[PDB]
């Protein structure tokens, strides 16, 4: 129970959304990370469809 409102974590990899992330989406603790593969970029979306 160390993920409530008060704790703050930093993911130090270029794959934030690569791993499972929803598990702490509602813990209240703010979570920040890094995304090199911007799933919002156009090239990646057409890639995701085929993927």
For a second copy, which is the closer residue by CB, 3 or 33?
3
For a second copy, which is the closer residue by CB, 7 or 16?
7
Give burial (CB, 10 Å; 0-12/13-18/19+) of 35: middle
Distance CA 31, CA 51 (A): 27
Decide: 5 and 29 in contact? Cβ < 8 Å: yes
20 binds a second copy, rule: CB under 8 A: no
23 binds a second copy, rule: CB under 8 A: yes
27 binds a second copy, rule: CB under 8 A: yes
Instruction: Catalog residues that contact a second copy under the rule CB under 8 A.
Output: 1, 3-4, 23, 26-28
């Amino acid at each position: 129970g160390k993920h409530v409102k008060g704790y703050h974590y930093i993911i130090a990899n270029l794959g934030f959304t690569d791993g499972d992330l929803l598990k702490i989406q509602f813990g209240g603790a703010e979570v920040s990370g890094f995304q090199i593969v911007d799933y919002d970029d156009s090239l990646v979306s057409k890639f995701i469809e085929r993927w």
